[PDB]
Amino acid sequence: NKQFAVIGLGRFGGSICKELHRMGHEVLAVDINEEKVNAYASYATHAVIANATEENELLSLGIRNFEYVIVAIGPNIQASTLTTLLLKELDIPNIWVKAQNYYHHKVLEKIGADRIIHPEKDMGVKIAQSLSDENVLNYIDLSDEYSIVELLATRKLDSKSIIDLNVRAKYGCTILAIKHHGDICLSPAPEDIIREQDCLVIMGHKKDIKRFENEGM
Amino acid sequence: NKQFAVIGLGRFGGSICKELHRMGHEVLAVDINEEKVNAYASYATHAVIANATEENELLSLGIRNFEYVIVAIGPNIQASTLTTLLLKELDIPNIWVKAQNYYHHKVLEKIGADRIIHPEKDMGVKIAQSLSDENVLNYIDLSDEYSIVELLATRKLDSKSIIDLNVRAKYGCTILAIKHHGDICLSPAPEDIIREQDCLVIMGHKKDIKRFENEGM
Amino acid sequence: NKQFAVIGLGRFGGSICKELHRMGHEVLAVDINEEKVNAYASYATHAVIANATEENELLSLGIRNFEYVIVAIGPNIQASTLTTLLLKELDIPNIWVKAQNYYHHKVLEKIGADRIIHPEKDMGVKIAQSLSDENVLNYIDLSDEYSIVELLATRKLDSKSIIDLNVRAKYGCTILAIKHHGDICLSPAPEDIIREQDCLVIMGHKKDIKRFENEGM
Amino acid sequence: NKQFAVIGLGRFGGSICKELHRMGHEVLAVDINEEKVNAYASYATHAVIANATEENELLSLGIRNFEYVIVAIGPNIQASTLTTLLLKELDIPNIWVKAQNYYHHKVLEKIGADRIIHPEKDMGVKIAQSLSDENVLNYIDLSDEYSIVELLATRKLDSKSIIDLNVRAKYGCTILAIKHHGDICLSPAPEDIIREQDCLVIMGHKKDIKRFENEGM
Amino acid sequence: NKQFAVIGLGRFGGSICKELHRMGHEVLAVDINEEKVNAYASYATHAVIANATEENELLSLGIRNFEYVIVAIGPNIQASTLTTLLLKELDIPNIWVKAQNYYHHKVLEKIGADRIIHPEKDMGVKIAQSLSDENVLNYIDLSDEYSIVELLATRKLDSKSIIDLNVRAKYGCTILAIKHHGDICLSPAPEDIIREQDCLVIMGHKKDIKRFENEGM
Amino acid sequence: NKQFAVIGLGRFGGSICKELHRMGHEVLAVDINEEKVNAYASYATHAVIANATEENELLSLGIRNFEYVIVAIGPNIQASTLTTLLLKELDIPNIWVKAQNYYHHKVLEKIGADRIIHPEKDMGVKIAQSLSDENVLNYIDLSDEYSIVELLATRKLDSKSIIDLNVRAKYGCTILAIKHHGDICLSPAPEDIIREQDCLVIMGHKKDIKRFENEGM
Amino acid sequence: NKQFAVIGLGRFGGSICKELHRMGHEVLAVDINEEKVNAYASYATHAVIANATEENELLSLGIRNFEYVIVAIGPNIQASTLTTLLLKELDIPNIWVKAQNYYHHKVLEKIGADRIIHPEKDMGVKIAQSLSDENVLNYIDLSDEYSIVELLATRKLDSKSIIDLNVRAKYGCTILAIKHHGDICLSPAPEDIIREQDCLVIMGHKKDIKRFENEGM
Amino acid sequence: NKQFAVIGLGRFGGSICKELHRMGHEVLAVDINEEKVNAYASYATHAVIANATEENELLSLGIRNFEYVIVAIGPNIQASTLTTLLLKELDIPNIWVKAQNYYHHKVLEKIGADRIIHPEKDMGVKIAQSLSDENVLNYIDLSDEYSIVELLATRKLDSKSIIDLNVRAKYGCTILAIKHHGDICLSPAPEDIIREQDCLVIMGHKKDIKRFENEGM
Numbered sequence A, B, C, D, E, F, G, H: 001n002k003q004f005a006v007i008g009l010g011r012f013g014g015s016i017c018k019e020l021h022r023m024g025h026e027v028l029a030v031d032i033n034e035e036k037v038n039a040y041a042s043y044a045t046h047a048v049i050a051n052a053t054e055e056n057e058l059l060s061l062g063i064r065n066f067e068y069v070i071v072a073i074g075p076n077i078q079a080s081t082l083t084t085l086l087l088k089e090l091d092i093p094n095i096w097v098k099a100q101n102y103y104h105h106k107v108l109e110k111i112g113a114d115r116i117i118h119p120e121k122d123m124g125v126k127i128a129q130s131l132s133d134e135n136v137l138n139y140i141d142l143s144d145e146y147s148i149v150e151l152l153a154t155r156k157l158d159s160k161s162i163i164d165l166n167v168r169a170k171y172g173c174t175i176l177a178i179k180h181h182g183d184i185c186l187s188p189a190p191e192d193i194i195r196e197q198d199c200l201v202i203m204g205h206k207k208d209i210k211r212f213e214n215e216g217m
């Protein structure tokens, strides 16, 4: 299908490998720690003990063949950077590397990483957003001003109808989905009821959504 | 406003503190490492050097007053656990803790953590999704089966109309937004045109969205 | 008689199980590693392969029946903690747990471990005592100031009598036993002789015993 | 004073180093793990990062000068053995090594270890002894058969006199000390009273002490 | 005076250090190989064994103080690159690095090396020039086209005057110096004689000098 | 024309071969490594895979015919020596050999090498010279005391005339050339201007040139 | 036939493997250096890259099956000792080990090596014998006093008969063999002729043989 | 008597010097390592610290006077070669040099070494011989097919007579010597008895000797 190499079976890397394996892709799980290789042996096509900073080992893995290589090493800047460099000189098409800090990001950038990810930082931003606003369970920003938001329904919304809560005119936002007891309602009709503690999916302008949050719920 | 305590100024914790501070909330940035405290001094209300496992220091911080306390310590399972536990005995309303792996999650759960987060794991899943499918720029999962996806438009979608691409009937999914050259169109009418390289926001079942990606683009 | 459960057949745990079995007590030896179960099969009443963190397995062991359960898992803090906790919720009378370090000691303490042991640490202290003082073979502290000490006799003590070495008056300490060529003399009379390289058992104040070591031997 | 080298800052080794440093001896704490060196920097004279497996590094430490070298590495048999061998060829006077199992003990023995210690095993035996007999707080074995035991007094012993409990004739054992509310009585006269929950220090044959425990308390 | 750090005491680095030391400059000779440190101990102010890729060792050297740091490591691209990066982050004013190949040059360039040198390559070019033309003793290129050349005089030039050999008009080149039996004539007048086997210093265009070599000598 | 044999296509040897080929000479590129024969195939007349220590292969090359043979093997002292020796016994007119160190230089010297070169060492000296003195770009020593130096112009020299900087009288040195933006001025007249960052070519006594560097620029 | 394992393909080991292979025995050539494995690939049944100190690799070799295992590692005392120990614990029938010095010999002895060889030392003794006495080509000592010696015939022995050189009576020694131009004469009759430069095999007392060497040749 | 110079006191060289000294020859032991000079001071006439590659030191030794000079340096090819070369230019009659591998043998050969020895290799062949055939104690090859072998007698040979074991007719081989309890019997008569565990010296064809070994013992 498509070949993926996950170097560094951490939380992040391990998750990548496990999920990708669940999707049914050819995933090579590489780690210097034997116990990590042993741990993700069930969740990969081939799990190998290797020092990714050692070139001959990298050739012994046959990494040149892979379309995507992911360096999920993030506290050892040295190892990460070095590995990325090795892969670059070996003409790997796509090199995705975790990064630790702004300068590690810089060095990855300069040695030609294709995509640099900061999982902890981004998730930090998200969870902080959820912290300052208890109503938001999840969300996605369409742009600087427009967003789709998932909200936890309060008592103020219990037994209320979509036509009762006229968001499309009063607030310029549109409701997309209602999740009740695990059951799911997509693009619901105005007659539908929202019960408390249910998942509500609204879409619109950020400020408008906050307006609805304040006065509605 | 609302008082937040961020213990552990890593990428994740640091991001939480910085972002929350950008929102203009009272954020207490706590760290045992002096240089971290010095680093996030600009991005907090009060930045303090403290050993969060030492109770008398925790009383010296006056942590009982805070509505939300975030334990962003994730490689030192031990310290994290003790700290969370300390906060629990001190009757803190909301304790959100960063976890490393499943059993650390278990012990946090059992000592009564209010919310446990796995940033690296979740972001790993997301990036893996983006890896197996180059077309997805971003997304949000409404549930195990239903999701809203942001897609990068290919040439197959160039100059195509919403009524031309009948997703609501043929694939059971609904288009929510179109982003063209930075300009943004929310809940667009069937006459609207989609140009390649534009942002397309579809909503529906995961498998159905994959179907549309397959035959459509 | 009395029922004991030893979870974790390490050196320490294995020693507990083997020794208890030699005394003729009902000892259930539990381990996740099959080879450990096979190893201590001869030295237990019932040796079972079980994941002690998995509750249903813990019920399958019928651990609720046991008066004493010993968690001898010490490098995997997580397994130890989770297991100890499981036992606590199952209302086990006495839970003795092996600890690795101070904060793990803390979390064990707070989740209600009944007795926490640091074998390596304590034995370290003892062997260090023996290191700085080649004369001391072993000892037991009665209190902060008073102790019973086992000493290796030097040439200065060869062919010396108990009445000759008046410890009861000159140093306020009392000799308890003399071990000569494996032969043993308990509470010896003043006429008895001490030959070099023999075991001498003195009792008294620490500083006083040091005094006697200094001027006497 | 006297120079000590502690190689391997584990629980056991770390305890040795910390305790020895508390005694005010010159202790060189050596470890391959940087974080361990950093941890015990406060509890040593000189804390060095070194792989004790490399000879030139061992010369860089100047280990030939030390009277006592302690190999506190116990799960890595290879490293332990090798270090011990290196030290032996370097004509170190006293080499004390922590062992894991019987065969590692054998190889240490054959390559000329001066003293081999099994902390976990021995402490296991002790704790097992305390487990089968809740009454014993501590003890020291004078030989295979004779021992001095510290006992927790029960209700059966409350308000009883030493002459009342004639251990010297009825059981052939002798009482050495009584600890009451922290206060301490050494080699007490027959008129003295024992109150419950006090520390009792008996001396004699193992079987005899068990007998006294049985009928007496 | 000025402080120099030479990391990597190979031939190139060693020559740098030795020569600089001969000039009487403060030169810190750093090497991971003990024998190299021992070799250049006589030819430096301070010769230290250090792993230049290890940051804490680099701080232990106190390298931040130095005006010039030279990475003379050229077959280990890894070590060179890594070290250079470390020095850059430590805000070293001038970092001169020895390179192996074009891509190592590239990565050095991108991580901000101040001067990159290819000794073997350049000297290769020079020696090749001397190989195809047996007559040239030495030379210096002013530019791609213009150069000053030192020539060994043949019989065709014996007893010839500067005015006889009109290089300034016939070939557009100018003679700068004549070395006869060790005696030296700088900017000689047209009456001066050139005897064979003497050193002749001409200056001009490369082609013109070759022309003069061809028809003249 | 003239025939050259380059044995060992390293950086140095490869540079020799490539440069010689650019001049249009008959160059035989010999290497035991197939990939280097393949690499320099474009930059030679004939590129052959051969073991230069094997005599029959050397006869198969027909090396006796060549006027110049260059042994550019420098880390394998053995191969270098044996090869050079082979060539000597085969009565080769000119044998130029790359040397690694002083003693290899000795053995090459004694087995009758015609010219021995140390590229790394010499270039080391040069680059070191440039290191202690940022102002000098290049130079050539006419004798122990007299030299021609190429200098990088500073701000102190900007917009200054040759007659303004009277070097011929004030410092006894003479300016030979000025290189401005790649353009070149040979033996310039006193009216000419020197702009900063330009190449300046002075000629005279070493100490005098320094003097001029000191007070002038 | 019989199975041999040669670990360490040095001069000594490599020679063992090559010679053994020439005899047509099943020889497993094991080496950690890939190039050594590649070198002796032609001179073995199976040539494998393996770290003989790593147990799992040793099981991957299936070394338990072999009757004879030879540790030909001699400058790395560590590897030799460790490997030998591994083989011993794996119940290998015959373990022959190359030793470096007296103490390495000691540790090999104590860990139960079956045969310890010192090639350099022994050959040193032999070559020394040939050095002090130029006359001897080869020899074997039957005892402290009696020996069989191979001698290079001089001119004094040319065209001489066995009956002419009466060694059996005049010197008490006996001639055993004469080798002339590769042709061989075993236990030759008294009529036989010895020509110079031939191999002569005499047998007797050392001093007597020396006597014959002195007066005879 | 005869003057010998042993340069390089390793095992091989040291053995040479020691053995030569035991025979009572004038042996000059030369070494650059002071401790080796100190070590073999007792086993030489004159033991000197000298760098054998340095000519003036070689004249300071007065090596021109010696009939035999032995270069026993074998891992430092460079030093060995240069030294041998120095001795050659100094017109030394006999230069015997220890070689490492085939090419070092080549360079020694070509710079005119008189005798080149490979101790490890040859001894390798021998020990290999003994490895494939456990029966042989020692031997000497007269030619490719004919040999004299020393054998360890088994039980099959106990109390057997020479006439009983008719080797001269049945196997075409001849017995030369019998060594019993240190006592020695040369060219024994047919009545003589062979007891087990005695040394037996047979002579003949290799295959024939193996035949006798097979059916006979």
Ligand SMILES: Nc1ncnc2c1ncn2[C@@H]1O[C@H](COP(=O)(O)OP(=O)(O)OP(=O)(O)O)[C@@H](O)[C@H]1O
Pocket (backbone or CB within 6 Å): A007, A008, A009, A010, A011, A012, A013, A030, A031, A032, A033, A036, A050, A051, A052, A053, A072, A073, A074, A075, A076, A079, B120
């Ligand atoms: N040079 C190397 N070659 C191969 N694998 C390596 C190398 N260095 C580190 N690794 C592996 O990469 C993994 C990266 O996880 P690490 O322990 O570095 O923390 P982390 O990745 O930041 O944590 P997480 O991924 O859980 O957030 C480790 O399991 C380690 O075994």
Ligand SMILES: Nc1ncnc2c1ncn2[C@@H]1O[C@H](COP(=O)(O)OP(=O)(O)OP(=O)(O)O)[C@@H](O)[C@H]1O
Pocket (backbone or CB within 6 Å): A120, A121, B007, B008, B009, B010, B011, B012, B013, B030, B031, B032, B033, B036, B050, B051, B052, B053, B072, B073, B074, B075, B076, B079, B080
């Ligand atoms: N007991 C403690 N008390 C206070 N601060 C701590 C404690 N333990 C860790 N920290 C701080 O919390 C921060 C957490 O980041 P850390 O380096 O532990 O990796 P992480 O948090 O798993 O990864 P990330 O930095 O991406 O979140 C660290 O910078 C550390 O200084």
Ligand SMILES: Nc1ncnc2c1ncn2[C@@H]1O[C@H](COP(=O)(O)OP(=O)(O)OP(=O)(O)O)[C@@H](O)[C@H]1O
Pocket (backbone or CB within 6 Å): C007, C008, C009, C010, C011, C012, C013, C014, C030, C031, C032, C033, C036, C050, C051, C052, C053, C072, C073, C074, C075, C076, C079, D120
């Ligand atoms: N979750 C678990 N369930 C059951 N058994 C476990 C679990 N985790 C570890 N064990 C067992 O407990 C034993 C504990 O010994 P381990 O090797 O973990 O080191 P240790 O106990 O600190 O060292 P030692 O006991 O040798 O001093 C191990 O043999 C292991 O097989």
Ligand SMILES: Nc1ncnc2c1ncn2[C@@H]1O[C@H](COP(=O)(O)OP(=O)(O)OP(=O)(O)O)[C@@H](O)[C@H]1O
Pocket (backbone or CB within 6 Å): C120, D007, D008, D009, D010, D011, D012, D013, D014, D030, D031, D032, D033, D036, D050, D051, D052, D053, D072, D073, D074, D075, D076, D079
């Ligand atoms: N080759 C080596 N060289 C130097 N130090 C080492 C080497 N191998 C291990 N160590 C160090 O020695 C220490 C030994 O402790 P380790 O973690 O191996 O468990 P342990 O000693 O059995 O446990 P404990 O000492 O807590 O009972 C470790 O901290 C490790 O960093």
Ligand SMILES: Nc1ncnc2c1ncn2[C@@H]1O[C@H](COP(=O)(O)OP(=O)(O)OP(=O)(O)O)[C@@H](O)[C@H]1O
Pocket (backbone or CB within 6 Å): E007, E008, E009, E010, E011, E012, E013, E030, E031, E032, E033, E036, E050, E051, E052, E053, E072, E073, E074, E075, E076, E079, F120
């Ligand atoms: N990580 C490191 N840290 C510090 N020093 C290092 C490191 N790696 C290599 N070196 C040193 O740098 C020097 C580089 O020389 P090396 O042996 O790599 O060959 P080289 O430099 O190509 O040889 P030459 O310079 O003579 O051409 C070595 O002497 C080595 O000891």
Ligand SMILES: Nc1ncnc2c1ncn2[C@@H]1O[C@H](COP(=O)(O)OP(=O)(O)OP(=O)(O)O)[C@@H](O)[C@H]1O
Pocket (backbone or CB within 6 Å): E120, E121, F007, F008, F009, F010, F011, F012, F013, F030, F031, F032, F033, F036, F050, F051, F052, F053, F072, F073, F074, F075, F076, F079, F080
């Ligand atoms: N015996 C030999 N016969 C033929 N070619 C050889 C032999 N030995 C080495 N070579 C080749 O000669 C080339 C010389 O470069 P090498 O890698 O030996 O280092 P070097 O030449 O000292 O370094 P540089 O590349 O800077 O010149 C190598 O590419 C090697 O393949």
Ligand SMILES: Nc1ncnc2c1ncn2[C@@H]1O[C@H](COP(=O)(O)OP(=O)(O)OP(=O)(O)O)[C@@H](O)[C@H]1O
Pocket (backbone or CB within 6 Å): G007, G008, G009, G010, G011, G012, G013, G030, G031, G032, G033, G036, G050, G051, G052, G053, G072, G073, G074, G075, G076, G079, H120
């Ligand atoms: N840990 C190991 N595991 C397997 N093989 C090893 C190990 N260590 C060394 N060897 C191999 O054993 C061989 C021993 O030869 P080495 O280079 O050590 O010199 P040596 O044996 O003294 O020289 P010689 O055998 O020529 O007398 C080497 O070829 C090496 O590759």
Ligand SMILES: Nc1ncnc2c1ncn2[C@@H]1O[C@H](COP(=O)(O)OP(=O)(O)OP(=O)(O)O)[C@@H](O)[C@H]1O
Pocket (backbone or CB within 6 Å): G120, G121, H007, H008, H009, H010, H011, H012, H013, H014, H030, H031, H032, H033, H036, H050, H051, H052, H053, H072, H073, H074, H075, H076, H079, H083
């Ligand atoms: N240039 C030199 N001048 C004098 N002595 C030297 C010189 N080079 C080496 N030696 C000495 O010669 C001795 C030879 O032993 P070396 O360490 O060279 O290994 P080796 O001789 O091959 O091994 P072994 O002799 O143990 O089989 C060394 O002890 C060394 O000190």
